[model samples]
Each structure stands twice: as C-alpha cells, then as structure tokens.
Target: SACPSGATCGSYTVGGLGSRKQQVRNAGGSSLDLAVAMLQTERMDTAYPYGDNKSGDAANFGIFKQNWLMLRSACAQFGGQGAGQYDNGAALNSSLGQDVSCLHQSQSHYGLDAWFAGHRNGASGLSSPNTADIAAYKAAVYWIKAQLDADSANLGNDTRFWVQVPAI
Candidate 1:
C-alpha cells in the first residue's frame, strides 16, 4: 500500500519540524514509522508552512519539537520517556477526569491510546476524554504503538508514511 488506510499521504515538509523518522529512500518502512504517521495524519496542520498550527494542544508540531528534544534523551533513538508528546497524565486528569496517563509517552501504548481516546473529536468539550468514547480512539493509538515490533522488523524497500522532518 502507498499509505496507511484513510490517510491522504504524499511528500510533506514544513518549517520547524525536528528530526522525525524517515519515509523516503531506503531509510524507513516500519510500523513505528506508520504509528507516528498516523498521529501526524490525524493532527498535523495540513497547510503550507506545515508546522504552523494555530495552537499546540491538538497537533503534531509541538511534539515535532519534542522529537528534536528526543535526540538528547537517553533512549532518544526510539522516542523514550516521551513527556511532551502530549499530556503526561497528572495535569490532563484534572479537567478531563478520565484519568488519562497521556502526558508522558509510557512504554505501554496506553498513554498514547489514552490521548487518542479523548482527543479524537478534537475533544475539547467532549465530556470525558476516556469514557465510552475512548474505546475507539484508544484502540487506534494502541493498534499503532503496538506495532513498534513490526516497525523494528520490516522490508527495506517498503514505505511507511511521510511527514516533514526538522533539519537535524
């Protein structure tokens, strides 16, 4: 497949993007890449000057910045200790009341799912972030992050998805 299901994929670049994973040449073709692709597909600002989303709360650029920051962290290669990918848990729980452990990207995909759980509808006033509404969103994030294993083992010629990478 050229791109993930439901994704309108193509060459995309924007300013201020950090060192994101690759989807070109013989570089990237992993489920982990697809997982990150999925998030960008859903949340990235789809306009030129691609990183210019109005606010950082509901899109991928802020975390694109984090991807640069990821380069400095201990497990930087595979995006470990993912604190700014979104809500880390404690703060988001206050207004949300769904008890999402989403701030830090936990080793378990739950944090990612917990985030997608509530935010699927651009969930500002969507009641609870993770009540029954969370199941579908949670499943999606979990489905992708769970594929980190597939991301680890993949064909060289395969393509995952594309997003702009910040100049390293």
Candidate 2:
C-alpha cells in the first residue's frame, strides 16, 4: 500500500501503488516468503515454494505475481537480515517498511475465466492475464503468502520496525 510521503511506501505486482490489489499481493508475498525461510532455518515445518518455477503454478497467478514482485522489491530496499534477496528472512520491518497483499486463484478457477472475459470485453481498465502468464504468477503469490505469514509476529507497532530513512 502507498503510505504518505516519507512514510513507509511499498511496491507490489499489481500497480506498484497503494491499492487493494497491491495490499493483497504484499500480504500474501510477505507471508509466503517467511514460511519458506522458516523451513530453511528449521524454524518451521513447512517447505519453501521458491522452486515452483515458471513451468509450475507460478504462471497461474499472473496478477498476484506481478504485484508481489513489486512488493518484494520494495521490501528488499530495507536493510537487515530479512532483505537478502530470495531468502530475505521473512517480511519487511514494519517500523520502516510498508506491508503488502494479493489474491490467489487456482488453475481450474472459473473466476479466472470470468475475469479475463470481462477484461477482454473492455469492461474495465484492469490488466489482462493470458495462459502464458499464469505459471510465474501463481508461483509469485505462493511465495509471498508463505513469506508474510512466517514473519507476522515481527511486524506491527514495536521497536524500530519502521524507521525514517534519510533522503538521498
């Protein structure tokens, strides 16, 4: 979501702006990422879905993936152990970083068809999703949800989670 100027602003797959779609992607991505990292450090029993590449479900959630990528990028901007690329611990520090979210649709999802049809009719200005864009998309969303969930407790009002970074 888009925080106030100088506030913790987060980017994501959808529009890279403060919006509902962006929020979903951010939250999902954060949760997914944390879950993955936890599995790596033996902090949790779940497995990281990072390996679910383009040929897999990642391509299924194109919309979610797009926004999630942006959110991941924004979170990476923050420093510390959690910002180390793919294994960036889990979730961004809330005190100095904004949160994000996204919605996940399945492969046999009718909602996906309806969404595409409606958009194809020029019913709205939303981005279009094709069969080719589905795999990576699904993977992105899956990754994000795991990230945020694992790091949920570290967020919210506490300590210096989100601090004021000096302007360059």
Candidate 3:
C-alpha cells in the first residue's frame, strides 16, 4: 500500500519553528492569525497556512482558527490525560473555554459545537485577534499532543509529526 489511511506521509521542514509538533502548534496559531493577516497578507497561503482543512473550515480563516483551537485542545487533552473520546463535558469544555477565554458570555456547548461544526455562516461574528486565537489554540494542542504515544516515541526522527523538541 502507498500508505496507511491514518498515517501521515511526506517530507516537511524540521526547523521552521523547531519541529512538526511545534509546527502543528504554530500552524494552529496561524489559523487564528488567518483573519487579521488575511486582509493584510492578501493570500490564502499566508492567510490560512496550516494547509489542512480536515473539516473544510479552511474556507474561512477565522472559523478554521476557532475550530483548530478546539480540535487541538481535544487532541492535546486526549494525548495528555489519556482520556476517552471527547464527550463535550462541562468541566473539559469549560477548561478549554478558559484556555481561549472564548466569549463565556456566549453559550458554551453550542459555541463549542459551532466551533466543531466549523461555525461559519451560523454564528453572528468572526473569531479574531488573530494572534491571541492562534496562540491559545496552539497551546491547547501542544499540551494535548504532548501526551500522545506517537509523539513520545518519535523523539529521534527530525521530521516526524508531534516532534519532541520545539522546531529548530
């Protein structure tokens, strides 16, 4: 077979920010920075940047940013906590909510689901500050991804996903 369905296959830089895990964290941030940078950067390559739309949220950078934050958090939590599948629990969601300081004034579960569903065209506003959204999201993902076994096992490969060291 060319590759397994869940395996990531390709060559990627090992030192953009230091490593792929860092890059993943960085990419999550870039997704948030998408909105602010888009109008300024004027290109999707620079605007959305992560290059993965796993959920098609990439259509708009802000939604992509928000969803990425949530997704990263989910990945990070599962990786670190060694937890079960995501259940939209109040504690976890609230903990993640506090992580981003996403509008607590906004409805919580629905807001998170909106994020999961890639809340574009449904919610009334664009998620932004670009930098803040991205940072928060990346941190969440970094923490969660840190707990995964694959990331832990691949400490020697320079280009592996979920890298051990920060990108070079």
Which candidate comes out best when scored by lDDT?
1
Residue by residue across 1-168, what tens digits does model 2's lDDT show?
233333442322322222322343344534443322222222221123432232221111122222222223223333232222433322322211122222222212225443332222212212354433333333333343433444553322121111122211
Model 2, poorest ten-residue lDDT window? 159-168
Better of 1 and 3 by lDDT: 1
Per-residue CA lDDT of candidate 1, range 32-83, in tens?
4345444444322233232233223333233222221212131222345344
Better of 1 and 2 by TM-score: 1
Please count the clashing residue pairs in each candidate, in the order shown.
8, 56, 8
Which should have the higher TM-score, number 2 or number 3?
3
lDDT of 3 by residue, 1-168 (tens): 122223322323344323423333344433232222221221212233332232322222222233333333333432333113223222222242332343222225445434423333222223332343334434433333333333443322333222121211
Over 4 Å off, model 1:
1-34, 41-53, 56-60, 63-114, 117-127, 131-133, 155-158, 161-168
lDDT (C-alpha) at residue 145 in model 3: 33
Worst 10 residues of 3 by lDDT: 35-44
TM-score (C-alpha, index-matched) for candidate 2: 0.22
- For residue 70, give model 3's deviation from the true position in Å: 11
